[PDB]
Swiss-Prot record, chain B:
The lineage of its organism: Viruses, Duplodnaviria, Heunggongvirae, Peploviricota, Herviviricetes. Homomultimer. Makes the hexons and eleven out of twelve pentons. Interacts with triplex proteins 1/TRX1 and 2/TRX2; adjacent capsomers are linked together in groups of three by triplexes, heterotrimeric complexes composed of one molecule of TRX1 and two molecules of TRX2. Interacts with scaffold protein; this interaction allows efficient MCP transport to the host nucleus. Interacts with capsid vertex component 2/CVC2. Interacts with the small capsomere-interacting protein/SCP. It comes from Human herpesvirus 2 (strain HG52) (HHV-2). This is Major capsid protein. Self-assembles to form an icosahedral capsid with a T=16 symmetry, about 200 nm in diameter, and consisting of 150 hexons and 12 pentons (total of 162 capsomers). Hexons form the edges and faces of the capsid and are each composed of six MCP molecules. In contrast, one penton is found at each of the 12 vertices. Eleven of the pentons are MCP pentamers, while the last vertex is occupied by the portal complex. It is found in: Virion; Host nucleus. Belongs to the herpesviridae major capsid protein family.
Length: 49, 47
């Protein structure tokens, strides 16, 4: 609309978008550590056995 | 946008007080008994 609303609402979505990119890049950055436990517990039989 | 510049204002005036400080874990904590300090002869029940 040219008003301060329609510009600031666009700023609202971009800084909203700025959080989601930092979120899912952190997802695979930690998700690698998750999978390493699942490949070490696919192997590793118990100690008494 | 990782806004953390909310405030950085004063770091105000400081003094030196006899208090009771111990070390539990990595957290350094006060100790205080409130009988003789604030509830001396006051006839109000201590909570």
């Amino acid at each position: 609309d040219g008003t301060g609303i329609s510009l600031h609402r666009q700023l609202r979505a971009i800084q909203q978008l700025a959080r989601n990119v930092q979120a899912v890049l952190g997802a695979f950055e930690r998700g690698t550590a998750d999978q390493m436990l699942h490949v070490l517990l696919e192997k590793a039989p118990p100690l008494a056995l | 946008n990782r806004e953390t510049l909310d405030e950085l204002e004063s770091a105000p005036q400081t003094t030196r007080v006899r208090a009771d400080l111990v070390a539990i874990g990595d957290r350094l904590v006060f100790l205080e008994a409130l009988e003789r300090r604030i509830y001396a002869a006051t006839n109000v029940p201590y909570p």
